[PDB]
Amino acid sequence: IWPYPSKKAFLARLRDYFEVGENAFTLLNRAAGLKQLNSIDEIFRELVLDDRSAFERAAEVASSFDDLTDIHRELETARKQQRSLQPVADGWERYRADQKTELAKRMSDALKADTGALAEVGRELVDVPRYLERLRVLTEEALPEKLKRFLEYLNRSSDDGVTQLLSYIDHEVSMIEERLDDLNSTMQRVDFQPGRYLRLVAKKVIHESLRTLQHAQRQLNSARFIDDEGESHYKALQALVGLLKDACEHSRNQGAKALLDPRFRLEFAVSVIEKEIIASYVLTASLSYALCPDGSSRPLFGTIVLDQSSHAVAGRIIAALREFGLHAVFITPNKEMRLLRHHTRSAVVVHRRGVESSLVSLSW
Amino acid sequence: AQQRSERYVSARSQHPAWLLLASRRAPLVLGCLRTLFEEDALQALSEMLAAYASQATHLQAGRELREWIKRRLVVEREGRIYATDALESAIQFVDSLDSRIMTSTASRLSVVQREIENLETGLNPSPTGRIASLRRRIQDLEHELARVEAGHVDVLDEAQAIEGMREVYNLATSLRADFRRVEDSWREADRALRHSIISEHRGEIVDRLLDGQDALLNTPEGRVFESFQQQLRQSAELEVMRERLRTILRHPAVPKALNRPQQRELRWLALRLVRESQAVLQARARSERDVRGFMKTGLAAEHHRVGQLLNDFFNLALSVDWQRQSERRKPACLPPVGVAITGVPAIER
Amino acid sequence: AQQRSERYVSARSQHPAWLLLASRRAPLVLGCLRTLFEEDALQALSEMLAAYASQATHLQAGRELREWIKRRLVVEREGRIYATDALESAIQFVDSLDSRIMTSTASRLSVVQREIENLETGLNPSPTGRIASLRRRIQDLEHELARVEAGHVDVLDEAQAIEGMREVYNLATSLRADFRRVEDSWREADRALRHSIISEHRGEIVDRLLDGQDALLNTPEGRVFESFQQQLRQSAELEVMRERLRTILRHPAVPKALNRPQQRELRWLALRLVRESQAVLQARARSERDVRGFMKTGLAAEHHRVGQLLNDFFNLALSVDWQRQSERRKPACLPPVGVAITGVPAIER
């Protein structure tokens, strides 16, 4: 006996008991109430594959960029202050060589751009050293520190931020292609038609948003070789972050989902090297592949649940299930009680009377 | 508490010392570099990387050297490699793992107390307390003299002598810690000045800077180093310090306190300090001379303009099709410069 | 030169601090551990590792914690986790990459000169030299007093005051460096004593050790710590030091020299030093009490012979076929111990 007051540990133990993956039961649940067999692309993109979109990381990247913009503003403010303060230093040298009006004008200009450092300073010649001291503090202490922090944040945000997201998406696409190859391999041991079997092909799609994103990425790559103390790199990164923000803002469009959702970066086709039969074959092959330990072909978990077509239509589904070695439980209203009598050899009847229900299990 | 983790991650990603320590070939790189600073770098690195296959060569040696140059672990000035502060910090951390001198001792406590007393009495401007402290110290010294005249000369025991020798070595060896830090501080000031001159290029700034004789490249570390090296020059106390060190090193307890390298380091302390301090002012002078030469050349505006044009060309180059051989071999427009004659006048004879 | 590379490679392979620094999750582990020492460790480590996926959490958290416990970076005594010296060395290296106080200053040079003079005069047994030195120092102090009486009180400038404050902080903060080192030194002595008792087990050794009242677990670091903590108890100077620190901290130049945490650390120096020194003697007493209890239990010979028998069984177990289910389920030869009687089937009678 093993009790768990926690569903997480219970499910971990359950997935360890039957040597299956982390998504077999989710797939089993999806195909246990599916209403209608839709187009092949829709079925493969909605049922077989699991949702691993990257909409969450985009928000974090955007927030980090918005944090970086503040450091950039601080650096720009410091540079603006220094550029205004320098002419006062030039004017003092000129005076030590009338010109007091120009020096007063320069001190007024310097006080205009100050943000509190020169709080209460007049235009008296005794206040000239004070300005100079401030200038020195700008040149030797504040500006190097702000520049260093800005460069560190820029490099970290550009490398550990937007760069890894696209690599993750490409890796997900590669994993999808490899899994598709494996599914094609495991679907060969069956005959959809006498001496014929199905095959799955994936083709990359193209979109305007994808082209814009790739061009922006190329610009970001090309802008890293300039020596501008990081200005061009920041400008190049800003456009890419803006594109990601625009994509994430409206997450219910084909263009936006083509960027951050790997499943929408591919188009799937079926070869016969019928829609209901093909959909059932693909679903059954996916279920068989999911419920199989690596290096083995016999599932440890065998029972699956299905819903729902002439006699010949359903005659191949049963054969496929028996070939893959799966036990099935069907759900059907009081409409198709003619062909299930030939394949299913038992029945469970649910009687409702008021607000109560009862189950009776009987053979045919 | 949360910000500390972010700071640690940033330091891990950026700082050269942690990157060097976390590198794959860290022990060999550290050993080779420490041996060097005691092209040829490429040859020595390849030699050391050769007989350590375990776990090309020349290609990877060059790649590693250029990777460390990019990370600013070392610097390349004209054709030579120079060490930085991160390398010495990493070396100190690595070689402190074997033997570290204890600082939780009684001698360190006495030094701290005396230093605190000296500092506290140094900041007091009152002319009344100072006389009181002077009288107290004079009276205490007189009492000790009276006690000694009775025949009570005190001598440190063997353990106390060893502790004192080790503490003196530990304190004295720390005077060389920040020699590379000053040079690293000057280099970045030079780089920032050149960038500001280029980005401005206004000729008035260059003319004003050239006209003045006041030295450029001023940094907070430079002033501290100047104050240190000014007092280093007062030989009237350096001679006394050297003589006292020579007297100390001739004691029976020395072999049990310090080994041979430590005795050598304490033996030639003053000479090495003066020699290494005189080698930093020359670096500063060279930096200033190079900056003045660059300013006098007067090609900053051309650099700015060519940079802008190259940026425009590189932006434009992303919109053509490089996958077609027809476009890659399409003739461009660039005039013939440095036209050599047509080989010969076509008369061999 | 060749041996240095071998030493570096050995340190890279073995020493816990370098292994921690070179680990994949070094920054987050360092941050979490530093926050802790300021199950629950496993829970907090999992919580921190949760929102850092980027780049089954609870399994790898425990695996890495047990990996560090095996590597002796951290120690597990009964159900608690305690820090070691390697962790503090790594923390000191990591957090010094941001701000390091310069030691190539004039104040450090003056301190070194005064300390060298003090040691050299303290190692001299001759009374005549002592009398001469005392007379010279008294004369110099009298000259300074005469100068001061004329109205020449000297006060440090702002830069000198800042330099002195930073140097005093740097010297004073180093008194806590080796508190974990002493405990690490005692633990290995405990382990060695227990191993020697087991391997010997002769009852005469145990009886002789138990009979004597002389304390066991003697190490070179323990004597240094005892000498330090004996002088720490002389409050007649601790009070003066604390008052001088309080006077120093009330100066206009303090905000420009030290930030808030450094001022706090200098503010409560003596109290924290005494409190942390009193927490090491208790650890030593607990270690000695545990060793004496283990010796009094008297189960060492049983441990030795059961270890020998287990080694024999494990050597024999390599010669059977574990791939056959028939042999894995063959009944063995072990008696029933702790027999639980069957419930009587009366049930309802």
Side-chain angles (χ1 to χ4, degrees), chain B residues 175-199 202-219:
Chain B
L175 289 172
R176 308 169 53 261
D178 313 309
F179 277 159
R180 307 289 156 259
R181 192 170 169 181
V182 185
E183 306 180 10
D184 292 2
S185 133
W186 283 330
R187 294 194 194 102
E188 61 181 8
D190 184 359
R191 184 176 308 113
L193 177 58
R194 294 197 183 193
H195 273 276
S196 75
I197 288 182
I198 285 187
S199 292
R202 199 72 62 257
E204 187 269 351
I205 302 177
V206 179
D207 294 326
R208 180 185 62 89
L209 292 173
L210 277 178
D211 190 14
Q213 298 181 3
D214 196 4
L216 321 104
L217 309 185
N218 299 116
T219 51

Short mmCIF file of all heavy atoms in Angstrom, two decimals, chain B residues 175-219, unseen atoms left out:
data_model
loop_
_atom_site.label_atom_id
_atom_site.label_comp_id
_atom_site.label_asym_id
_atom_site.label_seq_id
_atom_site.Cartn_x
_atom_site.Cartn_y
_atom_site.Cartn_z
N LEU B 175 51.98 45.17 0.17
CA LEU B 175 52.23 46.48 -0.40
C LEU B 175 52.29 46.47 -1.92
O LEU B 175 52.25 47.54 -2.53
CB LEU B 175 53.54 47.06 0.15
CG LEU B 175 53.51 47.49 1.61
CD1 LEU B 175 54.89 47.85 2.11
CD2 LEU B 175 52.56 48.65 1.79
N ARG B 176 52.37 45.30 -2.55
CA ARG B 176 52.44 45.18 -4.00
C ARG B 176 51.10 44.82 -4.63
O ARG B 176 51.06 44.54 -5.83
CB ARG B 176 53.47 44.13 -4.39
CG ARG B 176 54.84 44.28 -3.76
CD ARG B 176 55.70 43.05 -4.01
NE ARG B 176 55.78 42.70 -5.42
CZ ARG B 176 55.05 41.76 -6.01
NH1 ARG B 176 54.18 41.03 -5.33
NH2 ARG B 176 55.20 41.54 -7.31
N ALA B 177 50.02 44.84 -3.86
CA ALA B 177 48.77 44.26 -4.34
C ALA B 177 48.20 45.03 -5.52
O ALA B 177 47.68 44.42 -6.47
CB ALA B 177 47.75 44.21 -3.20
N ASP B 178 48.29 46.36 -5.50
CA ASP B 178 47.53 47.20 -6.42
C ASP B 178 48.42 47.93 -7.43
O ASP B 178 48.11 49.05 -7.84
CB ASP B 178 46.71 48.22 -5.63
CG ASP B 178 45.96 47.58 -4.49
OD1 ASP B 178 45.26 46.57 -4.72
OD2 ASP B 178 46.08 48.09 -3.35
N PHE B 179 49.52 47.31 -7.86
CA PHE B 179 50.36 47.95 -8.86
C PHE B 179 49.76 47.85 -10.25
O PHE B 179 49.82 48.81 -11.03
CB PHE B 179 51.77 47.36 -8.83
CG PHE B 179 52.65 47.97 -7.78
CD1 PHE B 179 53.77 47.30 -7.32
CD2 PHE B 179 52.36 49.21 -7.25
CE1 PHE B 179 54.58 47.86 -6.35
CE2 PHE B 179 53.16 49.78 -6.29
CZ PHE B 179 54.27 49.10 -5.84
N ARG B 180 49.16 46.70 -10.59
CA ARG B 180 48.51 46.55 -11.88
C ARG B 180 47.17 47.27 -11.94
O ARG B 180 46.72 47.63 -13.04
CB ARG B 180 48.30 45.07 -12.19
CG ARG B 180 49.57 44.24 -12.08
CD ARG B 180 50.53 44.55 -13.21
NE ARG B 180 51.90 44.23 -12.85
CZ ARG B 180 52.81 45.12 -12.47
NH1 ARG B 180 52.52 46.41 -12.41
NH2 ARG B 180 54.03 44.71 -12.14
N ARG B 181 46.54 47.49 -10.79
CA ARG B 181 45.25 48.18 -10.75
C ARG B 181 45.38 49.61 -11.24
O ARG B 181 44.50 50.11 -11.96
CB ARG B 181 44.71 48.13 -9.32
CG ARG B 181 43.27 48.53 -9.16
CD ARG B 181 42.81 48.18 -7.76
NE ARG B 181 41.52 48.76 -7.42
CZ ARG B 181 40.92 48.62 -6.25
NH1 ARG B 181 41.47 47.90 -5.29
NH2 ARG B 181 39.75 49.20 -6.04
N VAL B 182 46.47 50.29 -10.87
CA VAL B 182 46.68 51.67 -11.31
C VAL B 182 46.81 51.74 -12.82
O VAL B 182 46.22 52.62 -13.47
CB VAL B 182 47.91 52.26 -10.61
CG1 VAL B 182 48.08 53.72 -10.95
CG2 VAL B 182 47.81 52.07 -9.11
N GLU B 183 47.59 50.84 -13.41
CA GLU B 183 47.77 50.83 -14.86
C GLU B 183 46.47 50.52 -15.58
O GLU B 183 46.15 51.12 -16.61
CB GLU B 183 48.86 49.84 -15.24
CG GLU B 183 50.18 50.06 -14.51
CD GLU B 183 51.24 49.07 -14.91
OE1 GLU B 183 51.03 48.32 -15.88
OE2 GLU B 183 52.30 49.03 -14.24
N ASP B 184 45.70 49.56 -15.05
CA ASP B 184 44.38 49.29 -15.63
C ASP B 184 43.48 50.52 -15.54
O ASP B 184 42.69 50.77 -16.45
CB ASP B 184 43.73 48.10 -14.94
CG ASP B 184 44.45 46.80 -15.22
OD1 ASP B 184 45.48 46.83 -15.93
OD2 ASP B 184 43.99 45.74 -14.75
N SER B 185 43.59 51.28 -14.45
CA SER B 185 42.80 52.50 -14.32
C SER B 185 43.21 53.55 -15.35
O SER B 185 42.36 54.26 -15.89
CB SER B 185 42.95 53.06 -12.91
OG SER B 185 43.22 54.45 -12.93
N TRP B 186 44.51 53.67 -15.63
CA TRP B 186 44.97 54.64 -16.62
C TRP B 186 44.57 54.25 -18.04
O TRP B 186 44.25 55.13 -18.85
CB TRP B 186 46.48 54.81 -16.53
CG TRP B 186 46.92 55.65 -15.38
CD1 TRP B 186 46.23 56.68 -14.80
CD2 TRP B 186 48.15 55.54 -14.66
NE1 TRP B 186 46.96 57.21 -13.77
CE2 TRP B 186 48.14 56.53 -13.66
CE3 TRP B 186 49.26 54.70 -14.76
CZ2 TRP B 186 49.19 56.70 -12.77
CZ3 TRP B 186 50.31 54.87 -13.87
CH2 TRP B 186 50.27 55.86 -12.89
N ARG B 187 44.60 52.95 -18.36
CA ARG B 187 44.28 52.53 -19.72
C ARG B 187 42.84 52.89 -20.10
O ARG B 187 42.59 53.37 -21.21
CB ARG B 187 44.50 51.03 -19.88
CG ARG B 187 45.94 50.59 -19.76
CD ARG B 187 46.10 49.17 -20.26
NE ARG B 187 47.38 48.59 -19.87
CZ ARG B 187 47.53 47.73 -18.87
NH1 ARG B 187 46.50 47.31 -18.16
NH2 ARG B 187 48.75 47.29 -18.57
N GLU B 188 41.89 52.66 -19.19
CA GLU B 188 40.50 52.96 -19.51
C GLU B 188 40.27 54.46 -19.63
O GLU B 188 39.44 54.90 -20.44
CB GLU B 188 39.57 52.35 -18.47
CG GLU B 188 39.78 52.86 -17.06
CD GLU B 188 38.85 52.22 -16.06
OE1 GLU B 188 38.13 51.27 -16.44
OE2 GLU B 188 38.83 52.66 -14.89
N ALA B 189 40.98 55.27 -18.84
CA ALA B 189 40.90 56.72 -19.00
C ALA B 189 41.41 57.14 -20.37
O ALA B 189 40.81 58.00 -21.03
CB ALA B 189 41.69 57.42 -17.90
N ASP B 190 42.51 56.55 -20.82
CA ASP B 190 43.01 56.82 -22.16
C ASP B 190 41.97 56.46 -23.22
O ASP B 190 41.70 57.24 -24.14
CB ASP B 190 44.31 56.04 -22.39
CG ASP B 190 44.96 56.33 -23.73
OD1 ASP B 190 44.41 57.13 -24.51
OD2 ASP B 190 46.03 55.76 -24.00
N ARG B 191 41.37 55.27 -23.09
CA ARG B 191 40.38 54.83 -24.07
C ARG B 191 39.18 55.77 -24.11
O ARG B 191 38.70 56.14 -25.19
CB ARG B 191 39.95 53.40 -23.75
CG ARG B 191 38.99 52.80 -24.75
CD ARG B 191 38.67 51.35 -24.42
NE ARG B 191 39.88 50.55 -24.23
CZ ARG B 191 40.26 50.03 -23.07
NH1 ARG B 191 39.53 50.17 -21.98
NH2 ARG B 191 41.40 49.35 -23.01
N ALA B 192 38.69 56.18 -22.93
CA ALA B 192 37.55 57.08 -22.88
C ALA B 192 37.89 58.44 -23.48
O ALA B 192 37.06 59.03 -24.18
CB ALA B 192 37.07 57.23 -21.44
N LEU B 193 39.09 58.95 -23.21
CA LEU B 193 39.49 60.23 -23.79
C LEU B 193 39.53 60.15 -25.31
O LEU B 193 39.06 61.06 -26.00
CB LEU B 193 40.84 60.66 -23.24
CG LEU B 193 41.41 61.95 -23.81
CD1 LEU B 193 40.46 63.11 -23.57
CD2 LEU B 193 42.77 62.25 -23.20
N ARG B 194 40.09 59.07 -25.85
CA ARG B 194 40.15 58.94 -27.31
C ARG B 194 38.75 58.84 -27.91
O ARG B 194 38.47 59.45 -28.95
CB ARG B 194 40.99 57.73 -27.70
CG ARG B 194 42.45 57.87 -27.33
CD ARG B 194 43.32 56.89 -28.08
NE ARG B 194 44.71 56.97 -27.66
CZ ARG B 194 45.72 56.40 -28.31
NH1 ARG B 194 45.54 55.72 -29.42
NH2 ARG B 194 46.95 56.54 -27.82
N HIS B 195 37.86 58.08 -27.27
CA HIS B 195 36.49 57.98 -27.77
C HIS B 195 35.80 59.33 -27.75
O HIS B 195 35.10 59.69 -28.71
CB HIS B 195 35.70 56.96 -26.96
CG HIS B 195 35.83 55.56 -27.45
ND1 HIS B 195 35.06 55.06 -28.48
CD2 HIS B 195 36.64 54.54 -27.06
CE1 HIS B 195 35.39 53.79 -28.70
NE2 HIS B 195 36.34 53.46 -27.85
N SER B 196 35.97 60.10 -26.67
CA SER B 196 35.33 61.41 -26.59
C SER B 196 35.89 62.36 -27.64
O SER B 196 35.13 63.14 -28.23
CB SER B 196 35.51 62.00 -25.19
OG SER B 196 36.83 62.46 -25.00
N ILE B 197 37.20 62.30 -27.90
CA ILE B 197 37.78 63.15 -28.93
C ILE B 197 37.22 62.80 -30.30
O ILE B 197 36.88 63.68 -31.09
CB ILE B 197 39.32 63.05 -28.90
CG1 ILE B 197 39.87 63.76 -27.67
CG2 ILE B 197 39.92 63.63 -30.17
CD1 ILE B 197 41.38 63.74 -27.59
N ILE B 198 37.11 61.50 -30.59
CA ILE B 198 36.60 61.09 -31.90
C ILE B 198 35.14 61.50 -32.06
O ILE B 198 34.74 62.04 -33.10
CB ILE B 198 36.79 59.58 -32.10
CG1 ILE B 198 38.25 59.26 -32.40
CG2 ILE B 198 35.89 59.07 -33.21
CD1 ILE B 198 38.50 57.82 -32.78
N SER B 199 34.32 61.26 -31.04
CA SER B 199 32.88 61.48 -31.17
C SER B 199 32.51 62.96 -31.22
O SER B 199 31.45 63.30 -31.77
CB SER B 199 32.13 60.80 -30.03
OG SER B 199 32.22 59.40 -30.13
N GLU B 200 33.33 63.84 -30.65
CA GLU B 200 33.01 65.26 -30.61
C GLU B 200 32.97 65.86 -32.01
O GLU B 200 32.03 66.59 -32.35
CB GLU B 200 34.04 66.01 -29.75
N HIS B 201 34.87 65.48 -35.15
CA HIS B 201 35.78 65.84 -34.07
C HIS B 201 36.04 67.34 -34.06
O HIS B 201 36.55 67.90 -35.02
CB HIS B 201 37.10 65.09 -34.20
N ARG B 202 35.67 67.99 -32.95
CA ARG B 202 35.86 69.43 -32.83
C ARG B 202 37.33 69.76 -32.62
O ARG B 202 37.98 69.19 -31.73
CB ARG B 202 35.03 69.98 -31.67
CG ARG B 202 34.79 71.48 -31.73
CD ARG B 202 33.81 71.85 -32.84
NE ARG B 202 32.49 71.25 -32.63
CZ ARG B 202 32.04 70.19 -33.29
NH1 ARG B 202 32.76 69.60 -34.22
NH2 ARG B 202 30.83 69.72 -33.01
N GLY B 203 37.86 70.67 -33.44
CA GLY B 203 39.26 71.04 -33.33
C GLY B 203 39.58 71.93 -32.15
O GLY B 203 40.73 71.95 -31.70
N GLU B 204 38.59 72.67 -31.64
CA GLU B 204 38.84 73.55 -30.51
C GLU B 204 39.22 72.76 -29.27
O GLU B 204 40.12 73.16 -28.52
CB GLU B 204 37.60 74.41 -30.25
CG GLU B 204 37.79 75.49 -29.18
CD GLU B 204 37.42 75.01 -27.79
OE1 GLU B 204 36.86 73.90 -27.67
OE2 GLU B 204 37.70 75.74 -26.82
N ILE B 205 38.55 71.63 -29.03
CA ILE B 205 38.87 70.79 -27.88
C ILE B 205 40.31 70.29 -27.97
O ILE B 205 41.07 70.33 -27.00
CB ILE B 205 37.87 69.62 -27.77
CG1 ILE B 205 36.44 70.15 -27.65
CG2 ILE B 205 38.22 68.73 -26.59
CD1 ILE B 205 35.40 69.06 -27.62
N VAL B 206 40.70 69.80 -29.16
CA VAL B 206 42.05 69.28 -29.34
C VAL B 206 43.08 70.38 -29.15
O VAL B 206 44.11 70.17 -28.50
CB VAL B 206 42.18 68.61 -30.72
CG1 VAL B 206 43.59 68.09 -30.93
CG2 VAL B 206 41.16 67.49 -30.87
N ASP B 207 42.83 71.56 -29.71
CA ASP B 207 43.77 72.67 -29.55
C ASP B 207 43.90 73.08 -28.09
O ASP B 207 45.02 73.32 -27.61
CB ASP B 207 43.33 73.85 -30.41
CG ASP B 207 43.41 73.56 -31.90
OD1 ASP B 207 44.32 72.82 -32.31
OD2 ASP B 207 42.56 74.08 -32.65
N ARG B 208 42.78 73.17 -27.37
CA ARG B 208 42.84 73.54 -25.97
C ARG B 208 43.60 72.51 -25.15
O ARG B 208 44.42 72.87 -24.30
CB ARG B 208 41.42 73.72 -25.42
CG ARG B 208 41.38 74.13 -23.95
CD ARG B 208 39.95 74.16 -23.44
NE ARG B 208 39.32 72.84 -23.50
CZ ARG B 208 39.37 71.94 -22.52
NH1 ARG B 208 40.01 72.19 -21.39
NH2 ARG B 208 38.76 70.77 -22.69
N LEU B 209 43.34 71.22 -25.39
CA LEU B 209 44.04 70.18 -24.65
C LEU B 209 45.53 70.19 -24.95
O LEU B 209 46.36 70.03 -24.05
CB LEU B 209 43.43 68.82 -24.95
CG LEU B 209 42.00 68.58 -24.45
CD1 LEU B 209 41.47 67.25 -24.96
CD2 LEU B 209 41.97 68.62 -22.93
N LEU B 210 45.90 70.37 -26.23
CA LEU B 210 47.31 70.39 -26.59
C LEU B 210 48.03 71.60 -25.99
O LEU B 210 49.17 71.49 -25.54
CB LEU B 210 47.47 70.40 -28.11
CG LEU B 210 47.40 69.05 -28.83
CD1 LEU B 210 47.50 69.23 -30.33
CD2 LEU B 210 48.49 68.13 -28.32
N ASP B 211 47.37 72.76 -25.97
CA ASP B 211 48.02 73.97 -25.48
C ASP B 211 48.36 73.86 -24.00
O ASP B 211 49.46 74.24 -23.58
CB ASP B 211 47.12 75.18 -25.73
CG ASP B 211 47.83 76.50 -25.45
OD1 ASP B 211 49.08 76.49 -25.33
OD2 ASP B 211 47.15 77.54 -25.36
N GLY B 212 47.45 73.33 -23.19
CA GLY B 212 47.69 73.24 -21.76
C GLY B 212 48.77 72.21 -21.45
O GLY B 212 48.88 71.17 -22.09
N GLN B 213 49.58 72.53 -20.43
CA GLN B 213 50.62 71.62 -19.96
C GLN B 213 50.15 70.73 -18.81
O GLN B 213 50.91 69.87 -18.38
CB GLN B 213 51.85 72.42 -19.52
CG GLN B 213 52.50 73.23 -20.62
CD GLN B 213 53.73 73.98 -20.14
OE1 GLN B 213 54.13 73.85 -18.98
NE2 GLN B 213 54.33 74.77 -21.02
N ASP B 214 48.93 70.93 -18.32
CA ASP B 214 48.42 70.11 -17.23
C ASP B 214 48.22 68.68 -17.71
O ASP B 214 47.68 68.43 -18.79
CB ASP B 214 47.10 70.68 -16.71
CG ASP B 214 46.71 70.12 -15.36
OD1 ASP B 214 47.50 69.33 -14.79
OD2 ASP B 214 45.62 70.46 -14.86
N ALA B 215 48.66 67.73 -16.89
CA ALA B 215 48.63 66.32 -17.28
C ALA B 215 47.20 65.81 -17.35
O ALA B 215 46.35 66.15 -16.52
CB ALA B 215 49.44 65.48 -16.30
N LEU B 216 46.93 64.99 -18.37
CA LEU B 216 45.64 64.32 -18.51
C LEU B 216 45.71 62.97 -17.82
O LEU B 216 46.67 62.66 -17.11
CB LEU B 216 45.28 64.19 -19.99
CG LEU B 216 45.63 65.37 -20.89
CD1 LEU B 216 46.86 65.05 -21.73
CD2 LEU B 216 44.46 65.76 -21.77
N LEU B 217 44.68 62.15 -18.01
CA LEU B 217 44.62 60.80 -17.43
C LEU B 217 44.76 60.86 -15.91
O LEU B 217 45.73 60.36 -15.32
CB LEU B 217 45.68 59.89 -18.05
CG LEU B 217 45.75 59.83 -19.58
CD1 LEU B 217 46.76 58.79 -20.02
CD2 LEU B 217 44.39 59.54 -20.18
N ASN B 218 43.78 61.49 -15.27
CA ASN B 218 43.72 61.59 -13.82
C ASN B 218 42.63 60.66 -13.31
O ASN B 218 41.50 60.70 -13.79
CB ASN B 218 43.45 63.03 -13.38
CG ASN B 218 44.53 63.99 -13.84
OD1 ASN B 218 44.27 64.89 -14.63
ND2 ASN B 218 45.74 63.79 -13.34
N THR B 219 42.98 59.82 -12.34
CA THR B 219 42.08 58.83 -11.78
C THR B 219 42.26 58.79 -10.27
O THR B 219 43.30 59.20 -9.75
CB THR B 219 42.35 57.44 -12.37
OG1 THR B 219 43.74 57.13 -12.27
CG2 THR B 219 41.92 57.38 -13.83
#
